[PDB]
Design a protein around this ligand. Structure first.
Ligand code: ATP
Ligand code: ATP
Ligand code: TTP
Ligand code: MG
Ligand code: MG
Ligand code: MN
Ligand code: MN
Ligand code: MN
Ligand code: MN
Lengths: 683, 289, 289, 683
């Protein structure tokens, strides 16, 4: 066993009844003085390194050609001047195993952390040396972390796409289904997770040109998509991951759910395609009143009204659907469907739950389209227009397929540096650059939506780490007050940066004029309610930083009205799974699953303590499963009120609790304004 | 939670010796050396002798003491496969490859063999020690049964699988593969019945049953190493056979809900080529906060 | 002189209820009176009980005491058929035709029915009285088994056969005919084993064994009469069924090598109407023509 | 039990030790007296019938509008003047259950046999009343039978395409694979059987964008295609049928074959995807000499030579591939592979066998392309060019995808009417019309090849029926003499009609000038070998008909040289599954499987004796399984020497014969010039 492995395992060997957390630090030293420094490839100077990486097809030469070598040297020197040290063994291990650039045979390390950060910063700046240094300082301080696609692939010749998630709308036609399968394979080839809205597809037993009971429903398309994602599995490196979203009022909703039952037959079971359910407020109202609900056949509704079932408001059209004899429907028990959802989430963690009305009551771009589904991580909530892929030799009507670039603020590092504004603006600029340089030649709706919406996702990580390292319980009202203030600041500065980009470029996102940003409605709660901290401890935490007031929000509203906004969507809180290790941060705004996690790598086992875990903050690092899910819902709703897109909200459940407890948590989330629920992980 | 599922898998795996024509094996058998033919004969007799104990005693004794009509039916089906299918299959292989006098001599030798006898009598001893209405003695016998089904057979299965993976003795190798596939499911099923008993015990009694299982495994394993050298040194395979024994010992432990005992090892590629949360209704007022 | 041919016959008769689709009986079942459905359910439940004990207890225990691996293989196979095939088939029929509550009720009814409990008590008592190496106790249990196979099932078999013969419930009837075909050969086989033991005795001992067999038959018969009346009076068939069971009692006696005991009678003619490919390598001469 | 069914089951009841065959005739009468006439919708006049069928969207207005009502009435009167009577119950039952037009509620019969024949004739003639009457006389004499798609769908508004055999070339790209899946779905939606060539696809473990061990091979593509064919199942009417062809020198050939093994796992086995193997002469030579063969990685060959492995002649390329270090290959035993093919055919009848050199040594259009694969029925053998389907908003390079037009001559009816020439020419004209009226808007290469090649398949059926009713054993040399003469006349008149159509329209098929028809090579064996019958009995059979001599063939060769040929391909012998029942004929040129076949429809049993079966010809109606497969191969080769495309050739084996016998039959077929082997049906 390696020396650093033994040093890391020495953490759990208690001394005087206490964990040896400091041993972890020793491990990193070993991991660098025995493996990383020996396995790294050193050159005489930076010129030889850059030339070797360029000619050997490791780096794209275009982004490096925008800078003179003196500027690149200055950027690299700025990166190395911080003398960044990984405080935990797992941070360095995760970076050098998942994100550091290696040779073709993967026998040596070509990229250090500073090298990777410098390359990403130079790609972000697009020829601006000062901007590149700003990005270097932002990432080496670990205030901002680009998503895994962006951080791993920026400036690389053998790179994939920098966009993490893609959302596709599938129209009710064989041509559209085949095009959706093709685009899903193309985007999984690019490495991104693909989500498909199957609510427009007509249910099982519908007519294909006057011959009835002909359609296979959404389950056949689900099987096709599952095989497509199995085939396109990132060249066999990462399993192809897809998501299917169906409205709960679709007739196939049961069969949909039956794809995830552990007793499902092979002709129905789907195993590589995640499932999500979109629940309008009408379904929750029907379940609450115990009135029997009706699921609908989409094609009959489309024939009668000319629009898809998910294209209009169910809260106002459900009674018209039920009373219409030309609309076909089936009777269901909404409470039984809710119990089935809870049982399925207990068994397998599926489906994702999207509260459609919670998303669309604060959605700023309802004029473009209502949000009808979410992404594979159930945090992207954007307007999408379905595409009409016609026959060959016929022009296709290209719609809008959602796609946003992810980037997370490290809350602990951002607040320690007292740089919410600067970090938010620089992250917005980096995400705007990632969107601008993204061009996908096989997904036309994705390309058009990227060019028009200009949507980005600016997330946050290390919420629980910051709260526990500052002596604040994650479930406490003080923690929710901190989240309210911090994310109001993040939203304020993201809107300010979006408006500044719109002013400097003279262009807004497409159809911005009909948005609530243009009409000023979006700023209502910000121009009437003060989001400054209500607790003295939180206010002290925010000292040295100008917390925006109602007057600052009014000025920002006027600025947006004058100049517009460059981005249709700005903030989305992704799960941030593996890149949180490198940043020494807790995953996303979720509470920690465990204080010390035991992970098996190779034939060895490693223990990763939570960042900053110690004796004095052991009980502030409360495990998520031990927490009240209602207070976690309160925290997520408090954050969500300042996030325009959704938050990947994983439910952390105990084995003792029943499906009724899961249903109660889901209904409280819906009541509190939670937009989406990601996972039901049971301990 | 599991008996009807195993019922289905068992009955759908039903097969008969007559389905595989054996005579075409003589076309590769004639080309093996004396040591290869000797080892094969001895291994085959070892498997035959152990499987007879399982058919006459092991499965019927467990079926007798286990409560539950559906479990008794599955266990009866497994006993049937031992006596009616497996035993006839082993006999058929022998009659095809050796003349009557050679078969009688090999069985005389293997019947007197110290390492074969040690393991055969250890297993049979535990079956004979089951007492009416005593679940501890039943569990111990189930452990013995799982060790036979999922572990002890494999020092023997190695050789037919080794030939089968090389294109030699393909007809008898196909038969052995079907037998092995039955023993695998037998081991898993009896393992689940043992875990049911184990889970009904106190923590101290559990620790005591774990010690029993590991101690028994150790005794059998040390004898398997000797058995292995005795048969396989003459054909140069013992090192690889030992890896296969440990790998299958780990499977047997996992069948009993226990952790693997041995480190993970890769297996000979030729042999490889041969080879609910509680539902509680919504009570209303859960929609109001 | 006979075991091998019984082995071959038993294994070639192998079947599973799932081979027969039962949804075709749904309408002819729906059309029967409540009295008819009640008698039918109860009749099959009585059969299920008999096969449960024949599979769990009777056949395995006889297998244990009979010498010879081939004889044991036949008896083990027959045991498997009893509980893994026959007893289970009745549940397939029940699950198709009846709602769960009616199924639950009929199984509760077997537990409390005095004639069914008495016949089980008597038959299973004799099975459990077998003493190792005591051929007389074994003979007595084999007589009991023949009486179960060739006599006791028939008060139950009458009704499915009666319907089959009228073109009603023909899928269920197909299952029952397969079960009956099996029991006929089971009764003959066990009968031959019983005769082996009987033929070893002195004339004085034989005289006592005939007394045992006839006394047991009469005791079972008197109980079966009451059972038959209890089930069939509500469908008007008790006298007809009684003639059928006497007919089959004579067949049971004959299976035991004894003379018929009841006089011949005309049975309902309806009930009488109710009755991989081989691989060769390619030669170099197969490529030229 | 209905009266006609009792009269049909009375056939098996033997009177005086003989089957009551004549009782079948009575059954037909009952089937018309009790059922057909009662459930047949009658109208006061044909005008009312046509108006009702057109208005209720049963027929098409376009093809009926080309004639005056007087001409349509005259065509219908010509059809009804024959007073055609079905000779067997199964003929009428199959027509009125499969082909007769029924109401939307499927309880009444709108079309009789004469009505359907008249409608198909009017569709064929395209406005010519005399041509329509000629077609009516052709089909009511039952001399020619349009295929099931053409016969069922001609003149019907609610219909699929008239072509049901489609051959697709799949290029080695994700875009091309997705396009192939889409086209397969679209063509299965149209009701056609789709065959895909997977030899150009790179094997498992190949590089994608210079990353190693990334390709899933052709098995993942087969899984995708199998899912696509399961999804597209003719609106839930028939099981989606597809075929995949792989060259035997493709490395995936074992895994390909492993998709049909019973022991294959669920992630390996494809259930609704037929498989065929293309066997070049090089593989047979390697197996014959027992030299170990090499299966090649297609992408390495493409990188080294710039052409696909299946696009070059393996006979001259195999040694260069083996000796090339940059071509990756795996060692195999060709005799073991042949034994595996025989074993798989014994177990399941798969794969289809295509002898590439047997096809291409007589292929007339090798300049366009060599025949690389066959159809789902393994009788279509045409040149195909792969298409380069690029990314979106990029022009695709459309190639040639085979789609031939099926139609079968009834040999008994054709020869008893002494009308080989007239029937062949009229069938060629009808096939040309159906090919010209086919327009598929979702298969670009299929449409392009249909427009360019103008390929049709004119088959024959009732060969064994005709031979048995004329006292000729199917295995006799006289039967082969008759087949030789009859199919040489069929080829002569097909070529003459193609040249006449080319002269009339002034156009040939695309790239005809490079074909062997243009160079006169095709006619070589016809201008030197006389194909007149060598037996007096066969000559008397051909009495009253002019048999083309060598001088006639020289004149035809000169005519083709002067005027060209309209069709790239003319003759292909399809299995003719259900149309053989309606025509009261034996299926294809195959020998009969059973003298009397027992079928179960609903809960009733039915008995179909072979047409013309009696006590006198009971011995001549020998069953196919009892026949010597070598003599069946000899007859099929005798026919194949006059057929430009292939013949659906099913092997009929007994359970006693082993895989050595199957391999011997396959090798004798290869030796005798058999192009394709369809199925290995074991009795
Ligand atoms: N935790 C760590 N994170 C990142 N790099 C590390 C870490 N530990 C060691 N290294 C690398 O290994 C080298 C070993 O030097 P070390 O940290 O022991 O101190 P040093 O030799 O006094 O110099 P310095 O600390 O100034 O780099 C470091 O210079 C650095 O490049
Ligand atoms: N074998 C058959 N094939 C086809 N149609 C038949 C057959 N038998 C009877 N029919 C149909 O039933 C009708 C009655 O025919 P039948 O044998 O009674 O005498 P017919 O002289 O042909 O009668 P019609 O006056 O109808 O012409 C036929 O006209 C035809 O429509
Ligand atoms: C072709 C086909 C379609 N479908 C379903 C899936 C699609 O969502 C739906 C629409 O198919 P379409 O491609 O729209 O079929 P269509 O346009 O010819 O019919 P229509 O005019 O009614 O739109 O039909 C199947 O389930 N199976 C099939 O094989
Ligand atoms: Mg459509
Ligand atoms: Mg390519
Ligand atoms: Mn066994
Ligand atoms: Mn076993
Ligand atoms: Mn029984
Ligand atoms: Mn029995």
């Amino acid at each position: 066993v390696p020396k650093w492995i033994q040093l890391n395992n020495e953490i759990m060997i208690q001394k005087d009844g206490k964990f040896q957390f400091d041993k972890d630090k020793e491990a990193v030293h070993s991991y660098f003085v025995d493996y990383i420094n020996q396995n790294t490839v050193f050159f005489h100077n930076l010129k030889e390194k850059l030339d070797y990486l360029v000619e050997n097809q490791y780096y794209e030469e275009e982004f490096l050609s925008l800078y003179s070598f003196e500027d690149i040297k200055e950027v690299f020197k700025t990166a190395y001047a911080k003398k960044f040290r990984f405080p935990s063994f797992m941070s360095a291990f995760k970076f050098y195993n998942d994100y550091a650039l290696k040779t073709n045979d993967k026998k040596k390390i070509l990229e250090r952390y500073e090298d990777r950060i410098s390359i990403v910063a130079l790609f972000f700046a697009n020829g601006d040396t000062e901007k590149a240094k700003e990005y270097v300082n932002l990432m080496i301080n670990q205030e901002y972390q680009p998503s895994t696609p962006t951080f791993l692939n920026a400036g690389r010749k053998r790179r994939g796409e920098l966009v993490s998630c893609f959302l596709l709308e599938v129209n009710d036609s064989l041509n559209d289904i085949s095009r959706a399968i093709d685009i899903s394979m193309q985007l999984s080839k690019l490495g991104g997770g693909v989500s498909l809205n199957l609510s427009k597809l007509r249910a099982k037993g519908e007519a294909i040109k006057d011959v009835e009971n002909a359609t296979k429903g959404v389950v056949g398309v689900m099987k096709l998509l599952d095989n497509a994602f199995r085939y396109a599995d990132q060249m066999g490196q990462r399993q192809g991951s897809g998501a299917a979203y169906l409205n709960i009022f679709h007739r196939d909703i049961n069969d949909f759910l039956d794809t995830k039952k552990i007793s499902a037959d092979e002709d129905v079971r789907v195993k590589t395609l995640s499932i999500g359910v979109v629940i309008p407020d009408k379904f929750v109202e029907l379940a609450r009143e115990d009135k029997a609900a009706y699921v609908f056949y989409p094609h009959t509704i489309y024939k009668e009204y000319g629009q898809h079932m998910d294209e209009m408001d169910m809260n106002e059209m459900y009674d018209k659907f039920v009373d219409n004899p030309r609309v076909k429907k089936e009777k269901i028990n909404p409470r039984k469907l809710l119990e089935k959802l809870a049982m399925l989430r207990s068994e397998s963690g599926y489906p994702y739950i999207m509260f459609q009305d919670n998303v669309n009551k604060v959605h700023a771009n309802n004029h473009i389209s209502k949000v009808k589904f979410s992404n594979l991580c159930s945090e992207v909530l954007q307007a999408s227009q379905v595409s009409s892929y016609t026959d060959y030799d016929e022009e296709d009507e290209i719609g809008l397929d959602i796609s946003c670039n992810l980037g997370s603020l490290n809350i602990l590092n951002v607040m320690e540096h007292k740089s919410i504004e600067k970090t938010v603006k620089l992250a917005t600029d980096s995400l705007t650059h990632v969107s601008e340089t993204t061009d996908i030649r096989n997904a036309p709706a994705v390309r058009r939506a990227n060019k028009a919406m200009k949507s980005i996702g600016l997330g946050a990580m290390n919420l629980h780490g910051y709260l526990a390292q500052n002596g604040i319980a994650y479930e406490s009202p003080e923690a929710r007050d901190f989240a309210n203030t911090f994310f109001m600041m993040v939203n304020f500065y993201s809107i300010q940066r979006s408006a500044e980009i719109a002013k400097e470029k003279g262009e807004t996102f497409d159809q911005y004029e009909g948005s609530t940003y243009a009409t000023g409605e979006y700023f209502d709660k910000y121009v009437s309610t003060d989001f400054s901290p209500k607790y003295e401890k939180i206010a002290n935490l925010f000292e040295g930083m100008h917390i925006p007031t109602t007057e600052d929000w009014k000025k920002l509203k006027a600025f947006v009205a004058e100049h517009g906004m460059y981005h249709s969507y700005r903030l989305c809180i992704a799960p941030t799974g593996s890149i949180s290790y490198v940043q020494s941060s807790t995953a996303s705004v979720m509470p920690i699953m465990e204080r010390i996690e035991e992970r098996t790598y190779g034939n060895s086992k490693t223990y990763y303590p939570m960042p900053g875990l110690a004796s004095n903050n052991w009980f502030f690092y409360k495990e998520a499963y031990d927490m009240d899910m209602f207070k976690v819902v309160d925290m997520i709703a408090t954050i969500q009120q300042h996030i325009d897109q959704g938050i990947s909200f994983t439910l952390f459940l105990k084995d003792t609790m029943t499906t009724r407890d899961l249903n109660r948590i889901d209904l409280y989330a819906h009541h509190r304004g939670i937009k989406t629920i990601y996972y039901a992980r049971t301990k | 939670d599991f008996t009807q599922m195993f019922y289905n898998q068992n009955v759908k795996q039903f097969w008969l010796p007559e389905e595989i024509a054996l005579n075409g094996d003589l076309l590769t058998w004639k080309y093996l050396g004396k040591n290869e033919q000797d080892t094969y004969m001895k291994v085959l007799a070892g498997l035959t002798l152990l499987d007879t104990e399982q058919g006459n005693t092991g499965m019927p004794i467990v079926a007798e003491h286990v409560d539950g009509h559906q479990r008794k039916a599955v266990l009866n089906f497994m006993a049937m496969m031992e006596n009616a299918v497996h035993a006839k299959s082993y006999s058929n292989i022998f009659m095809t490859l050796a003349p009557t006098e050679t078969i009688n001599e090999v069985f005389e030798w293997v019947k007197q063999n110290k390492y074969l006898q040690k393991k055969a009598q250890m297993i049979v001893g535990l079956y004979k020690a089951i007492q009416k209405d005593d679940e501890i003695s039943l569990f111990k016998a189930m452990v013995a049964s799982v060790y036979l089904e999922s572990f002890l057979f494999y020092s023997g299965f190695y050789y037919p699988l080794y030939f089968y993976g090389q294109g030699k003795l393909m007809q008898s190798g196909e038969i052995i593969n079907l037998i092995l596939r039955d023993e695998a499911i037998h081991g898993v099923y009896v393992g689940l019945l043992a875990q049911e008993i184990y889970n009904k015990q106190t923590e101290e009694k559990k620790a005591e049953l774990r010690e029993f299982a590991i101690d028994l495994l150790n005794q059998l394993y040390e004898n398997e190493l000797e058995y292995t050298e005795d048969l396989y040194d003459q054909v140069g395979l013992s090192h690889d056979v030992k890896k296969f024994i440990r790998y299958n010992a780990n499977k047997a432990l996992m069948n009993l809900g226990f952790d693997p005992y041995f480190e993970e090892e890769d297996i000979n590629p030729i042999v490889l080529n041969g080879l609910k949360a509680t539902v509680e209704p919504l009570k209303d007022d859960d929609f109001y906060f």
